Amino acid sequence: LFKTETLTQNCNEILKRRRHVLVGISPFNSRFSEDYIHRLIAWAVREFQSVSVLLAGKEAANLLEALGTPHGKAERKVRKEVSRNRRFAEKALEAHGGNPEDIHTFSDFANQTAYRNLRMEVEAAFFDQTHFRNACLEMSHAAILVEVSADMLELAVEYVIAELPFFIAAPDILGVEETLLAYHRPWKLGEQISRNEFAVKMRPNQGYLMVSEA
């Protein structure tokens, strides 16, 4: 039903224990359709003890703004899109035996200590290390995905910075022992992170699970 590919041999060991998976769902991404979300979550609930859903926070508007959508309309548009992702995930979670309250957005933790610490770690790296800054900008290019300017990227990159703590430690934010972030795309930044190319480090209880249909 789904084929999986881990980041590291560590990501693989977390995978073997099947404790928690954090399923990402992106706004405005043709991948996530009601039927697809239903299948993914179905598979998650089967394969793991515990399933959580991660949605896009407020900075998702930065993406629409980079595409020239005006600021006010951008927030309203993101609100509609994300609340719609939520409704689809709630349905699926309810239907397959998961907990409908296990949906979060990456903005929900803004005042949480664990989230703020991590966001600081990422900002310090973003500003200090040029390599990291560029990896991040490449990634925000990926997110916006008719020409793309450097200012568009300085805008959209807020999205990548806000999201990243769930990629490097979700467990600290959600209070869970260990977890895998499941998503359909390859994560290039993650591959570099895993090789110790930056001051940002993936926590030993976190892993990235690339998931694809079968």
From Swiss-Prot:
Record Gene3D superfamilies: Cyclodipeptide synthase
Keywords of the record: Transferase
Intrachain disulfide bonds: none
Outcome of mutating E163A: It is able to bind L-leucyl-tRNA(Leu), but has almost no cyclodileucine synthase activity
Positions of the record's site feature: Could have a critical role in the catalytic mechanism: N29, E163
Catalytic residues of the enzyme: S26
Superkingdom of source: Bacteria
Effect of S26A: It is able to bind L-leucyl-tRNA(Leu), but has almost no cyclodileucine synthase activity
Site (Could be involved in aa-tRNA binding): K77, R87, Y159
InterPro entries cross-referenced by the UniProt entry: CDPS, CDPS_sf
Ligand binding (substrate): N29, Y159, V160, I161, A162, E163, Y183, K188, L189
A molecular function GO annotation: aminoacyltransferase activity
UniProt GO BP: pigment biosynthetic process
Reactions it catalyzes: 2 L-leucyl-tRNA(Leu) = cyclo(L-leucyl-L-leucyl) + 2 tRNA(Leu) + 2 H(+)
EC numbers, comma separated: 2.3.2.22
Pfam family, one: CDPS
Effect of K77A: Strong decrease of L-leucyl-tRNA(Leu) binding, but moderate decrease in the cyclodileucine synthase activity
General function of this protein: Involved in the biosynthesis of pulcherrimin, a red extracellular pigment. It uses activated amino acids in the form of aminoacyl-tRNAs (aa-tRNAs) as substrates to catalyze the ATP-independent formation of cyclodipeptides which are intermediates in diketopiperazine (DKP) biosynthetic pathways. Catalyzes the formation of cyclo(L-Leu-L-Leu) (cLL) from L-leucyl-tRNA(Leu). Can also incorporate various nonpolar residues, such as L-phenylalanine, L-leucine and methionine, into cyclodipeptides.
Entry's family note: Belongs to the CDPS family.
Subunit structure: Monomer.
Name of the protein in its database record: Cyclo(L-leucyl-L-leucyl) synthase
Organism listed in the record: Bacillus licheniformis (strain ATCC 14580 / DSM 13 / JCM 2505 / CCUG 7422 / NBRC 12200 / NCIMB 9375 / NCTC 10341 / NRRL NRS-1264 / Gibson 46)
Species lineage: Bacteria, Bacillati, Bacillota, Bacilli, Bacillales
Gene transcribed to yield this protein: yvmC
